[PDB]
């Protein structure tokens, strides 16, 4: 059981993110830079790898 608007909203707060390539942390997909200072606030990021 999933359904369009339902499996879509679920992903919006779990898969629809951007995995930082230095600290991995979750940022808005439509991001540009990290909000953590352990990485020196890097810009190198990559959207959270999809399912195949």
């Amino acid at each position: 059981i999933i359904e369009p608007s339902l499996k879509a909203l679920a992903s919006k707060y779990n898969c629809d993110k951007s995995v930082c390539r230095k600290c991995y942390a979750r940022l808005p997909p439509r991001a540009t830079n990290c909000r953590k200072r352990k990485c020196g606030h890097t810009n190198q990021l990559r959207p959270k790898k999809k399912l195949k």
Binding site: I1, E3, P4, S5, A8
Partner: protein, 189 residues
């Protein structure tokens, strides 16, 4: 700014020559459908859309080629373009209010009215059965072809269309999310 200045001189050319015109508005339309319109009258009704370079067409209304420009500036707002002609309007008005049909259920578009459809064998082999499974609509096999069992009123008026049900409504020849392409203002001489 290069092409902004040349657009002025060009649209200016057709307005300075012809007798009567149409400042036609249209939000919902399709590119491919749009050029079929200009081809609907490749001569008597040549279309020409506009924007803020049309806010200057009112400052070209300040240029005033003829005093009749008063009855034109109060129609600049919305996706409104042009329609140039020199033949009787009732005849060509017939064509523009005959140049109006539209698009289907673009997964997640506006759902304003009631979604009701009858129950008779669709006429195609059992294909999108996995969708009506997680969807739950009464439909049984009648000579291989999937047959509508219930007069399913799918989605209720006023919401956001779901990806799954819109695609099967496409197979049902359901096109009600747009209906565009008319006039915004009527003007002559």
């Amino acid at each position: 700014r290069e092409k902004k200045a040349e657009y002025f001189a060009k649209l200016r050319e057709y307005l300075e020559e012809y007798k009567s015109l149409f400042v036609v508005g249209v939000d919902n339309v399709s590119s491919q459908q749009m050029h079929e319109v200009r081809k609907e009258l490749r001569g008597r009704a040549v279309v020409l859309m506009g924007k803020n370079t049309m806010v200057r067409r009112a400052i070209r209304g300040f240029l005033s080629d003829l005093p009749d420009f008063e009855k034109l500036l109060p129609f600049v707002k919305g996706n409104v373009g042009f329609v140039f002609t020199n033949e009787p309007l009732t005849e060509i008005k017939n064509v523009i209010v005959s140049n109006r049909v539209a698009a289907p259920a673009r997964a997640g578009a506006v759902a304003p009215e009631d979604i009701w459809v009858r129950a008779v064998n669709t006429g195609m082999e059992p294909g999108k059965t996995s969708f009506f499974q997680a969807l739950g609509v009464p439909t049984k096999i009648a000579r291989g072809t999937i047959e509508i069992v219930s007069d399913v009123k799918v989605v209720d008026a006023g919401n956001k269309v779901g990806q799954s049900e819109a695609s099967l409504l496409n197979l049902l020849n359901i096109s009600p999310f747009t209906f565009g392409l008319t006039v915004v203002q009527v003007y002559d001489n």
